[PDB]
Amino acid sequence: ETMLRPKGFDKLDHYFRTELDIDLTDETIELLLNSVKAAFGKLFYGAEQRARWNGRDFIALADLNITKALEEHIKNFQKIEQDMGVDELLEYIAFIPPVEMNVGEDLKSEYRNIMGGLLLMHADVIKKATGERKPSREAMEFVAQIVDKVF
Ligand SMILES: C[As](C)(=O)[O-]
Ligand SMILES: [Zn+2]
Ligand SMILES: [Zn+2]
Ligand SMILES: [Zn+2]
16 A cells, blocks of 8 residues: 555554454445445434424434444444544545535534444444455445444
């Protein structure tokens, strides 16, 4: 790899291998990030309605479709000291939530924790579903499919 590899990939690659026992490639990182981005969009299911019922004109964290299981991953992510590239990866995915309403700035400030939780959740699913320390394209495509069915 060189310094041109998209920013964050480096650090994610390094964290997944050394701390989670998952060997990623550029190809499987892209698949992983597309699945994270998809799941992130799914968290906005019901969010505009919940915001309106609360008298708000913006989406708050309280309005998102986050479950207890994801909340646990988000909390575990916040206690990680090593930088796994989440800030760079967030910019890389160029996330646009599927809503017309304003996303509140305090929620925007939590996007790194949400994405970090989604990354740890995906690592958990990779290990429990693929059977491969170095997942193939098809293994990762399967992870994205089964993740889509819990969001
Ligand atoms: C030098 As590396 C991103 O393969 O840990
Ligand atoms: Zn590369
Ligand atoms: Zn590498
Ligand atoms: Zn395929």
